[PDB]
Design a protein around this nucleic acid. Structure first.
Ligand SMILES: [Mn+2]
Ligand SMILES: [Mn+2]
Ligand SMILES: [Mn+2]
Ligand SMILES: [Mn+2]
Ligand SMILES: [Mn+2]
Ligand SMILES: [Mn+2]
Ligand SMILES: [Mn+2]
Ligand SMILES: [Mn+2]
Ligand SMILES: [Mn+2]
Ligand SMILES: [Mn+2]
Ligand SMILES: [Mn+2]
Ligand SMILES: [Mn+2]
Ligand SMILES: [Mn+2]
Ligand SMILES: [Mn+2]
Ligand SMILES: [Mn+2]
Lengths: 80, 107, 95, 100, 103, 86, 103, 95
DNA sequence: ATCAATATCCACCTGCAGATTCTACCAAAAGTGTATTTGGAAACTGCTCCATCAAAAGGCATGTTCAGCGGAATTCCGCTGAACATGCCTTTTGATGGAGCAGTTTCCAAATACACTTTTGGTAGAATCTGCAGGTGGATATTGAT
DNA sequence: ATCAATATCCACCTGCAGATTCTACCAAAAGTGTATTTGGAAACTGCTCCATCAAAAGGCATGTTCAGCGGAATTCCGCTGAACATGCCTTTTGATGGAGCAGTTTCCAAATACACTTTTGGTAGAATCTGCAGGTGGATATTGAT
């Protein structure tokens, strides 16, 4: 069992429902996973770059928050 | 003593805001005497505007504490704040809404 | 243990004048603090860009004011400016 | 025996209501934590994570995917369907400027 | 007939000819003076007595045509997604809702 | 010492100009309602940009809107322009 | 006397770049000796990458001077430059393209 | 005063090295001039915050490098970092 | 339209996680008084370029006519997702060493600052050079009738 | 498939606008050389909280079944493209007065740099407090079969 498959149909189905979606094609599950992988790669890459620069080995909430902000995806509620 | 903030009739920290402005400066730049006052009044005002709507959102739910969900309700529900606050509010969810064409049985 | 400044107590005071009998959860306060930090940053940033465009070194209340007109949507700006002129006045006239 | 079945689409509308009412996270936690750590491992090894960091990543991802499902639905409805398909997610990402 | 049927390109043929043509050129496609009046008129309704460096107006025109052209590419994707080849107001609206704009 | 009143200049963005813009954007067929929609969308876009440009102009106490004013206004709204400044 | 640029083996102006960093400083801000050097190298390198590609395009069009149209074909044409340069390039038009379902 | 700084003489030098018999129109040079200013403002900006987040007041070559890794796409970053490194090392080899 | 199976709703209830009221200590703020410093306003004014008016002519907008074919309405059928209930494997939760993240103090390599001398990019201006816009013409497509 | 009608592509060709090549100059830039200052790498360390591990919780994978969705097919009205006639208004070229922008210089209200004193927001450990999430029950609504 590959990690990305830990993001299961049921979880993907719940996200879509909160998104007001009514009926889901079967191919949607793999596509959503690719999309999440790309989103997470873009953000983690920036978080880890802030970590290394600070010479730490622990990615912190702030590193994630500054990474999200850099990408135009500002998040409130975790510092900064 | 009085204090800049009290002297201006504000709750927000004029002294602190001032200090902070001296650090968002052009190498050797200066900060006007009143600039901090003005800034502090602007932050105080917006904070009041959001608490006021978040506060109504919680009273209309017969509850005492403003939560992230209340803040999400107040912000996405007001055209001007919605426009100004693009950040994701952790724990806020979305405004309920189902497209007319999905709601159905039709006839 | 080094001090982390926050706007929490000032947010709480403003809360009290607005809904004297309402509270605010921890997670909600954290959001408000992020909101206040974010808005101050966008404002000081525009104001210093304004100063630089005009070959000036001082960030005066006049830059803070144009920055508010550039950052806030109509009504919000109308009142905010109004709240700003009003604090400066009350402060200019004092001892 | 007991023959009771809801019509296709009735439970689905009930789910939309339930999930738009609530605010909790919807992806199970450990699975998401594992995914995060694996993606990070390709950028740097022996990394640890504050707990609040993994949580911020999960809050950002879910807000992103939920909002992407809203635009995706708009694209399916624009094409007169009620079923979202990969081409709708694609059209939506293409217009957002994310391309992929 | 006598001088028989005067030649006529089928609907769509000249339109494709046009996309090839404008896509390979770079000139401003909106006439200049009328676009300058539109600018002066909108500016005036915000603050009277304003003057304009001529390059300020040229900057707004370049920005505007670059914004419209990119909006018609997105609108064209919404029409085709709907199996049409004709762009409609609903295609433009869909593109702007997804882009996160409004009006 | 004179005049001239500006009115309805949005009709100066003519149907042929809109068709040219759509051709460059790769559009093959255009419905009849696209033209008034495009005008409305251009008016809003210019209003937002001219509004910010004029705000920089006034801030600087000038009466002349400069190419720089337009360029900073385009930048604030995320629509960077190269060729005059940026 | 060797210039800091010459000392670094660069065409881009180190002294000036150092000056500009000191003035975008931030109060008690300091600018290290080598920060301007590294900056001039990134700037000179990006500039080199864009001209290399624009110059190839002005050449496949049997022409000597690079125009905004060449800068635009070069940038939209390269995945990474396209991603890095979102600005509108005045006078560059677009990359020719027609959707298969329109042909 | 009146004299305005430009990067045009430097862009010309670089153009001569990559395309010895190629010229550049003034419109094109204008774009290159904006492009360079834009990239520099973006790098200095990221380097400042970067320093800020770490409670540092000095912007070193180390901040510029991280700024560059955050701003450029994969491959452009590698080559730029290696050219940045090369020029620092050479520069310090004279002092 | 009549049941029957279930979902939904609301009044009420209580335990504990999250909030709060309390005391105290202190590095750092924040305010006052006094002295030096300087940015930028006010004023004079040189000098660019913006509004404007003039005239001439053809590129291009407007308005019409006509019919091709695209959009949208309807019909219909195969198949794909929704619903569901059986079956156990993975997540969640609460408890515990030790890894790093922070706080602290040391002390020099590095960065500021100022004085002298030198090298240079910007710019003003008469000036001789040249790439290419855009017009011309004929060779090769491309298109649409039949 | 031939074939008449246009469109397009392409390489040659040429007057000039936009470019590249000096001449003379000058404030500001940029580097050399001492003097004074200090930010933060470097080492040591205490204790938060991150990884891990056992047990208790509960959501997911699975296979069947068929309702109803998507899309293929077919029809057809009416709207949009193509072509054409007519002529207007944008473009082009030039000169003109002068609004307003921008350079230079003087001088003070406003802003900074200490020194000194006093209040305060943040943090620690604790005691008692409480809003409300989450669970009940019973009334009523909803949904789907007949
Ligand atoms: Mn809806
Ligand atoms: Mn008007
Ligand atoms: Mn295509
Ligand atoms: Mn001065
Ligand atoms: Mn006419
Ligand atoms: Mn059709
Ligand atoms: Mn250790
Ligand atoms: Mn020189
Ligand atoms: Mn040509
Ligand atoms: Mn120190
Ligand atoms: Mn159907
Ligand atoms: Mn005047
Ligand atoms: Mn206190
Ligand atoms: Mn409840
Ligand atoms: Mn019950």
């Amino acid at each position: 069992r590959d990690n990305i498959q830990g993001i299961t149909k049921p979880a993907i189905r719940r996200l879509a429902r909160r998104g007001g979606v009514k009926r889901i094609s079967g191919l949607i599950y793999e596509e959503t996973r690719g999309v999440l992988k790309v989103f997470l790669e873009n953000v983690i890459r920036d978080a880890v770059t802030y970590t290394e620069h600070a010479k730490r080995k622990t990615v912190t909430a702030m590193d994630v928050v500054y990474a999200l902000k850099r990408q135009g995806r500002t998040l409130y509620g975790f510092g900064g | 003593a009085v204090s800049r903030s009290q002297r201006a009739g504000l709750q927000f920290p004029v002294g602190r805001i001032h200090r902070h402005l001296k650090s968002r400066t052009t190498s050797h730049g200066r900060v006007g005497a009143t600039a901090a006052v003005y800034s502090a009044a602007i932050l105080e005002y917006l904070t009041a505007e959001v608490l006021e709507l978040a506060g109504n959102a919680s009273k209309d739910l017969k509850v005492k504490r403003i939560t992230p969900r209340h803040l999400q309700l107040a912000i996405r529900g007001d055209e001007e704040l919605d426009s100004l606050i693009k950040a994701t509010i952790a724990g806020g969810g979305v405004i309920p809404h189902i497209h007319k064409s999905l709601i159905g049985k039709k006839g | 243990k080094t001090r982390k400044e926050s706007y929490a107590i000032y947010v709480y005071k403003v809360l009290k004048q607005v809904h004297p009998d309402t509270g605010i959860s921890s997670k909600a306060m954290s959001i408000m603090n992020s909101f206040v930090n974010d808005v101050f940053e966008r404002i000081a940033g525009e104001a210093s860009r304004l100063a630089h465009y005009n070959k000036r070194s001082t960030i005066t209340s006049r830059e803070i004011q144009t920055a508010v007109r550039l950052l806030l949507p109509g009504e919000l700006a109308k009142h905010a400016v109004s709240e700003g002129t009003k604090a400066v006045t009350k402060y200019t006239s004092a001892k | 025996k007991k023959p009771h079945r809801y019509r296709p689409g009735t439970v689905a509308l009930r789910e939309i209501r339930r999930y738009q009412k609530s605010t909790e996270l919807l992806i199970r936690k450990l699975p998401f934590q594992r995914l995060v750590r694996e993606i990070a491992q390709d950028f740097k090894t022996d990394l640890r994570f504050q707990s609040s960091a993994v949580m911020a990543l999960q809050e950002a991802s879910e807000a992103y995917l939920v909002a992407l499902f809203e635009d995706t639905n708009l694209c399916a409805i624009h094409a007169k369907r009620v079923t979202i398909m990969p081409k709708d997610i694609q059209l939506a990402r293409r217009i957002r400027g994310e391309r992929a």
